[PDB]
Amino acid sequence: TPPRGVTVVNNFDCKRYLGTWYEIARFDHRAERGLEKVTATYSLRDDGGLNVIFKGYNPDRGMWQQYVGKAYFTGAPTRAALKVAFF
Amino acid sequence: GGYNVIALDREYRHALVCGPDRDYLWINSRTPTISDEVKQEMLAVATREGFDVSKFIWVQQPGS
Ligand code: NA
Numbered sequence: 001t002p003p004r005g006v007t008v009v010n011n012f013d014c015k016r017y018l019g020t021w022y023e024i025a026r027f028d029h030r031a032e033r034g035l036e037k038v039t040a041t042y043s044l045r046d047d048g049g050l051n052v053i054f055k056g057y058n059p060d061r062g063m064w065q066q067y068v069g070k071a072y073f074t075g076a077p078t079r080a081a082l083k084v085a086f087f
Numbered sequence: 088g089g090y091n092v093i094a095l096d097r098e099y100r101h102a103l104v105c106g107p108d109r110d111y112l113w114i115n116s117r118t119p120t121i122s123d124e125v126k127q128e129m130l131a132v133a134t135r136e137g138f139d140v141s142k143f144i145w146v147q148q149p150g151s
Binding site: 006008009013017022026028029037040071074080082084 | 090093112
């Protein structure tokens, strides 16, 4: 469920959201803290879901690292509300 | 976890994204940097929907 009292985009074209987005700004959590040059890459799955590939640079380990997840629309693909899991 | 696009321009170049609650929020661009103009409009949508924007970490990107 989205937070209470927020607007979700309701004219949503999934295909046009695909590819690579740079992360300009984030509220910090353990998953991301200290990571640099972050991007998320979205692609269409057979089951109608999205693949999510999160990528960032880890200065303390001196390596590029990625997190692999999938996203599912909670309602209709025209409304941009989704659930994400990482495995 | 919840994932929700709560703002998006007309050519899908700039997005505001939040989690299931007001502790999770991201500003994303197709470019590594955005303009002040674009920043202020994003902050202005965040504030209008009740997000504490003082929590933003401004992520290192090429050109920033
Ligand atoms: Na630089």
